[PDB]
Ligand binder design. Structure first.
Ligand SMILES: Nc1nc2c(ncn2[C@@H]2O[C@H](COP(=O)(O)OP(=O)(O)O)[C@@H](O)[C@H]2O)c(=O)[nH]1
Ligand SMILES: *S(=O)(=O)c1ccc(S(=O)(=O)Nc2cccnc2OC)cc1
Ligand SMILES: [Ca+2]
Length: 168
């Protein structure tokens, strides 16, 4: 089977693990250890083709740059997650983007900008407009998700796999 290697990136508390666990297990998990990284593998039917998705849920604990870069080098596509409720997490996406580009050396690396916590509109700190503008600058798609309500959860994983399939 095709194996699509997805890496979740983004600053702390944005929803990397909640998104991964909603996709994997159909549960909203609210207390997942912030420092725990893990890999997940699932067979999924992508546009009618059985494939395997592998998701590396990074937890930010790899501080040694060569090792972090090694993890990114193995990835084929990236979900770059921020929380719509934390402007600083949106700002931080630029750093993950630069890290990925240094390693992959390809501006067209499969990559979605993911604004999570869309069910907290009343706490929004990052406008849809500014996130769409950043996505346009980077030539990536912007999708807003909620790990709580499941909104666009399958979409971000499937659309990222579609980019991996098309581009690699
Ligand atoms: N309301 C809401 N809370 C979320 C969402 N995603 C994550 N959370 C909460 O935000 C906290 C951090 O999520 P987590 O996935 O552990 O963040 P990570 O550090 O990026 O892995 C947890 O308490 C989650 O329940 C979401 O879409 N909506
Ligand atoms: S490795 O398999 O021993 C390993 C070590 C650390 C992690 S992490 O906590 O998810 N940290 C990161 C992983 C990949 C890229 N950046 C990270 O933190 C900045 C995972 C696997
Ligand atoms: Ca996590």
């Amino acid at each position: 089977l095709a194996l699509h290697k997805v890496i979740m990136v983004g600053s702390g508390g944005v929803g990397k693990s909640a998104l991964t666990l909603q996709f994997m297990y159909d549960e909203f998990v609210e207390d997942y250890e912030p420092t725990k990284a893990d890999s997940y593998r699932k067979k999924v039917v992508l546009d009618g083709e059985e494939v395997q998705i592998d998701i590396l849920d990074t937890a930010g604990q790899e501080d040694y740059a060569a090792i972090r870069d090694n993890y990114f080098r193995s990835g084929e596509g990236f979900l770059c997650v921020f929380s719509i409720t934390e402007m600083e997490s949106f700002a931080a996406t630029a750093d993950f983007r630069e890290q990925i580009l240094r390693v992959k050396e390809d501006e067209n690396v499969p990559f979605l900008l993911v604004g999570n916590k869309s069910d907290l509109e009343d706490k929004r700190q990052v406008s849809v407009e500014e996130a769409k503008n950043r996505a346009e600058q980077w030539n990536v798609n912007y999708v807003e998700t909620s790990a709580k309500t499941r909104a666009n959860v399958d979409k971000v994983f499937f659309d990222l796999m579609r980019e991996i399939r098309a581009r690699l």
